Design a protein around this nucleic acid. Structure first.
Ligand code: 1FZ
Ligand code: MN
Ligand code: MN
Ligand code: NA
Ligand code: NA
Length: 327
DNA sequence: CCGACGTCGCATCAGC
DNA sequence: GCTGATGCGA
DNA sequence: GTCGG
């Protein structure tokens, strides 16, 4: 499948998906449209009719009809209409600010606040997260070249070890799968002193060090186990400076760590296949653990895990490199 | 016909 | 002031 | 909106 092979259809479906989530607040319709757009994006033929498309899992009657209208006319009356709707288009747009969801966007537009400019005029109505999202609106929509990610990893691994050399840190997500660009940086953190059985400054101390060396620039949220924030590489001499980036750091017990690494490495569809299969061998994998069923379905206690590959053993599959986990 | 469909940590709100 | 609900991101 | 018990 190439980009423009069914691009107009998947663009249409994705656009419909966003208005469902952001304006209609119909979240299951949101996933319905995305699932349709995903299965169509994978389909290796230029679609000729809605009936043709309806054969794919997740494409039903209503989308089949919409595809017919699109193929025949090059557009969709309902989408064109909501595109001109000042209220609805504004609500959908404002949700592009991290921290502004469907609800907040709704209330902003209710009281006349419709644009980024409007948001800038109204700081006192923004919470902390929303202000950061506004401040880095442009930066947050850019992707991160692997080269910068590697440099980001350099700093994170270095500063983590410097705080305590017994920390274990892993940059997972699309980076660990070897993607040539990434949307954010997903850092997983553990330490021998932290198990399920059992201080919680363990995460605080890492964040503070990365702040001290001015890598982490802002904080969206921060608890005892999960940090969400903003970071930036140092500017290489008198050159154009780097965009601010999203970084997550989360602290995981040692005995749950590699289940965590596996999950937060992904990808999405790989994770389900691997969750999905492995059902058919009587195990339940979650973000934290693998547990055995269970002759009529009662999960017993979590099994020991000390490597990624461990999990693969349990469910009888060859350890697969992160590089081949897109599906 | 009709309910499932993605869950969970953190920030902030709503109610007492 | 405390407890639970809601919004949010991913 | 789609699927399926
Ligand atoms: C959000 C999400 C994440 N994950 C796992 C797989 C993701 O690859 C991994 C990290 O989530 P991500 O950062 O939201 N996606 P990504 O890192 O693969 O891609 P990107 O570069 O951030 O765009 O965690 C899921 O399995 N289901 C999810 O719904
Ligand atoms: Mn990521
Ligand atoms: Mn992420
Ligand atoms: Na179908
Ligand atoms: Na948003």
């Amino acid at each position: 499948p190439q980009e423009t092979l069914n691009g107009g259809i998947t663009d249409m479906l994705t656009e419909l998906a966003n208005f469902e989530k952001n304006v209609s607040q119909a979240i299951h319709k949101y996933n319905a449209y995305r699932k349709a757009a995903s299965v169509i994006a994978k389909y290796p033929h230029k679609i000729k009719s809605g009936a043709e498309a309806k054969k794919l899992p997740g494409v039903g009657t209503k989308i089949a009809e919409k595809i017919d209208e699109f193929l025949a006319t090059g557009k969709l009356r309902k989408l064109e209409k909501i595109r001109q709707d000042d209220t609805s288009s504004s609500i959908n747009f404002l949700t592009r600010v991290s921290g502004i969801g469907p609800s907040a966007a709704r209330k902003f537009v209710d009281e006349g606040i419709k644009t980024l400019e409007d948001l800038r005029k109204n700081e006192d109505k923004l919470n902390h997260h929303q202000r950061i999202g506004l401040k880095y609106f442009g930066d947050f929509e850019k992707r991160i070249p692997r080269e910068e990610m590697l440099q980001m990893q350099d700093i994170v691994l270095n500063e983590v070890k410097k705080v305590d050399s017994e920390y274990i840190a892993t940059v997972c997500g699309s980076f660990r799968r070897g993607a040539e660009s990434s949307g954010d940086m997903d850092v997983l953190l553990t330490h021998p002193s932290f198990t399920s059985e059992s201080q919680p400054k363990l995460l605080h101390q890492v964040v503070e060090q990365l702040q001290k060396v001015h890598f982490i620039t802002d904080t969206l949220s921060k608890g005892e186990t999960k940090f969400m924030g903003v970071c930036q590489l140092p500017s290489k001499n008198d050159e154009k400076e780097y965009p601010h980036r999203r970084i997550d750091i989360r602290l995981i017990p040692k005995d749950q760590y590699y289940c965590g690494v596996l999950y937060f490495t992904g990808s999405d569809i790989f994770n389900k296949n691997m969750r999905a299969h492995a059902l058919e061998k009587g195990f339940t994998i979650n973000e934290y653990t693998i547990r055995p069923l269970g002759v009529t379905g009662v999960a017993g206690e979590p099994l020991p895990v000390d490597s990624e590959k461990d999990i693969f053993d349990y469910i009888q599959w060859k350890y697969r490199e992160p590089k081949d986990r897109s599906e």
